[PDB]
Design a protein around this ligand. Structure first.
Ligand SMILES: Cc1cc2nc3c(=O)[nH]c(=O)nc-3n(C[C@H](O)[C@H](O)[C@H](O)COP(=O)(O)O)c2cc1C
Length: 362
C-alpha cells in the first residue's frame, strides 16, 4: 500500500495520497457569493485528506455561472475564505482553492448587469447551469448564448486570474488549482469545437493553448510556481466540449508547455461523469515523462486502481469526488478497509446541512 505515504506537492507536503476532488456544492450566500460557516465545517470535517481541493471559485463576478458558487474577488469573500482555511489548518490539513471562469456555461441573470456571458466565440454551450428560485432552491436553466471576447479584453481575463491568486494567498490557501477543464472558459479556448477565433487565440493548438499558458505565467509570477496546480480534461468530451481530432497530441503539447513553468502539479480529470474511453498506459507514460511535478489522477477511481497506477509510478496521488462528499474521513476508511456511507446525490447541489455536513465519520 502506498496511498498512505507522504508526498511533496509543491510548497507543501501531503501525509497521504488520498485527495479531495474539487466539488461544487452551491451553498454559498447570495448576494455576495460568500462562503459560509457551514462550508467551513464541511471542509474542516475533511481535513485529514492528503490535500483538499476546494469547490470551483470565481476569479471575478463575470466568472460566475452558477447560483451558489463562491467567489474570491471581494473583501467579504476573502474574509470568509480566511476563516475556512484557518479551520482546515487548525486540523493540520492542507487546502487548495480551485479558481474558474465559467465562460459560456452561465446565464445572463447572474452576470454583471444581467448581460450575456463571455467565451472564446459566440456559440451556445447547449447545456444547462444551476440557478436558484424565489425560495433559494437550486434549479436547472438552459445556458445563455455567449458574446465572443474582444481581443483587447483578453489581458483583463489574465489579470483577473492573477488577482484571484493574490487573493488566494492572502486568504490562506496553500495552493491554487486553475480550472482548465470540463468545458469552462479556459477549456473553451483549448477546444476547437468551442473556439472558432481567427486571431492568435484560435486555430492551431499553440493558439488555443495561448490563453491558459498566459494565465499560468501570470499566476506563477504573482505568487510562486510551486504554489500553482492546474486541472485539465484533455481526453474525451465534457459538457459538450470535446478536445478536437488530435486530442492526444494536443494534450502532450499543453503538458510539455506547462512543465516548462515548473508548476506544483498536473491534475487530470480522465472522464466525464457520464463516462469515456480509459487512458492507456502508453498515454499515461507519455504524460508522465513530460511533467516533472505531481500528477493527480481522477475520475471514478477505486482504491485498487489508485494503488495500481501509483505503484507503476504513472501517477502520484488520486482525487476522490463523490466518495469524499459522503465520507469526511475517507482516508481512515480506506486505510482500515471500512465500509463507506451511502451517497445521496439529490443533495449534491444546493440546500443546507442535509447531505452536506451530516455524513458521519467512523
Ligand atoms: C456534485 C459534483 C460537483 C463537482 N464540481 C466540480 C468542480 O467544482 N470542479 C471540477 O473540477 N470538478 C468537479 N466535479 C468533478 C469531480 O472533481 C470529479 O472529477 C468527479 O466527480 C469524478 O470523480 P469521482 O468518481 O471520484 O466522484 C464535480 C462532481 C460532482 C459529482
Amino acid at each position: 500500500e502506498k496511498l498512505f505515504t507522504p508526498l511533496k506537492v509543491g510548497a507543501v507536503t501531503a501525509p497521504n495520497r488520498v485527495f479531495m476532488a474539487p466539488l461544487t456544492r452551491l451553498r454559498s450566500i447570495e448576494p455576495g457569493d460568500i462562503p459560509t460557516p457551514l462550508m467551513g465545517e464541511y471542509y474542516r470535517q475533511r481535513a485529514s485528506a492528503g490535500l483538499i481541493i476546494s469547490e470551483a471559485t470565481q476569479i471575478s463576478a463575470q466568472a460566475k455561472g452558477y447560483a451558489g458558487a463562491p467567489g474570491l474577488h471581494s473583501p467579504e469573500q476573502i474574509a470568509a475564505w480566511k476563516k475556512i482555511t484557518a479551520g482546515v489548518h487548525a486540523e493540520d490539513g492542507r487546502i487548495a482553492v480551485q479558481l474558474w471562469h465559467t465562460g459560456r456555461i452561465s446565464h445572463s441573470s447572474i452576470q454583471p448587469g444581467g448581460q450575456a456571458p463571455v467565451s472564446a466565440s459566440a456559440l451556445n454551450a447547449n447545456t444547462r447551469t444551476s440557478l436558484r428560485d424565489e425560495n433559494g432552491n437550486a434549479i436547472r436553466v438552459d445556458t445563455t448564448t455567449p458574446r465572443a471576447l474582444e481581443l483587447d479584453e483578453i489581458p483583463g481575463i489574465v489579470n483577473d486570474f492573477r488577482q484571484a491568486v493574490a487573493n488566494a494567498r492572502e486568504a490562506g490557501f496553500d495552493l491554487v488549482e486553475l480550472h482548465s477543464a470540463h468545458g469552462y472558459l479556459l477549456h473553451q479556448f483549448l477546444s476547437p469545437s468551442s473556439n472558432q477565433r481567427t486571431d492568435q487565440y484560435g486555430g492551431s493548438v499553440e493558439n488555443r493553448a495561448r490563453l491558459v499558458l498566459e494565465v499560468v505565467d501570470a499566476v506563477c509570477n504573482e505568487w510562486s510556481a510551486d504554489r500553482i496546480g492546474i486541472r485539465v480534461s484533455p481526453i474525451g468530451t465534457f459538457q459538450n466540449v470535446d478536445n478536437g481530432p488530435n486530442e492526444e497530441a494536443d494534450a502532450l503539447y499543453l503538458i510539455e508547455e506547462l512543465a516548462k513553468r515548473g508548476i506544483a502539479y498536473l491534475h487530470m480529470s480522465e472522464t466525464d461523469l457520464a463516462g469515456g474511453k480509459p487512458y492507456s498506459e502508453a498515454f499515461r507514460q507519455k504524460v508522465r515523462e513530460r511533467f516533472h511535478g505531481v500528477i493527480i489522477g481522477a475520475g471514478a477511481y477505486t482504491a485498487e486502481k489508485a494503488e495500481d497506477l501509483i505503484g507503476k509510478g504513472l501517477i502520484d496521488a488520486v482525487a476522490f469526488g463523490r466518495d469524499y462528499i459522503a465520507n469526511p474521513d475517507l482516508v481512515a476508511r480506506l486505510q482500515k478497509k471500512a465500509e463507506l456511507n451511502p451517497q445521496r446525490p439529490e443533495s449534491f447541489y444546493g440546500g443546507g446541512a442535509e447531505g452536506y455536513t451530516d455524513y458521519p465519520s467512523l
